[PDB]
Amino acid sequence: PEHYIKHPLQNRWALWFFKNDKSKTWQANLRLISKFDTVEDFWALYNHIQLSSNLMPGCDYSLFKDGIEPMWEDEKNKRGGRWLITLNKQQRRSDLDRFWLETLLCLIGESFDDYSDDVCGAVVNVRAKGDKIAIWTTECENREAVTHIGRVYKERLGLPPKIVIGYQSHADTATKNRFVV
């Protein structure tokens, strides 16, 4: 097997795209691209689509676990919430892409160890006033799971203690940070 088999991923993941159009409805500007369950199939995907820095304003990329949709109305998201990374305008150039690729590697690599199942997916927002990257998790009351994910993520993105990042539930956002790391 060692010689000819693809390296398999624990989960199947689906990459989604959100387009800015504003005439059309949200449920129509959100559209699937492709699914994949191997390392090699992930690179074939990653290598031919555009970088986050080159997307027109208001557009999103999303990687979610197969069967969970990148909207908080979904069963696995509704009690959930998200670790949020806020990027200033200058960080588009320097940090946005390398943070996005690191996020994708955390997800597909299953890097949050015994709380891997709490992770649903991640969303990059390309915006004129400040880009954003969020890892979404399934239950906002799992203090232990939510905390560990945050710390893993900051560590992996390489942020210093100085920087503090917020976790907020989708309820609180529809309607402050429940947790900070």
Binding site: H7, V39, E102, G109, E110
Partner: peptide, 12 residues
């Protein structure tokens, strides 16, 4: 259960 490090994923 399949786990891969940052280094494993870039190498592959």
């Amino acid at each position: 259960k399949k786990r891969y490090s940052r280094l494993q994923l870039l190498l592959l």
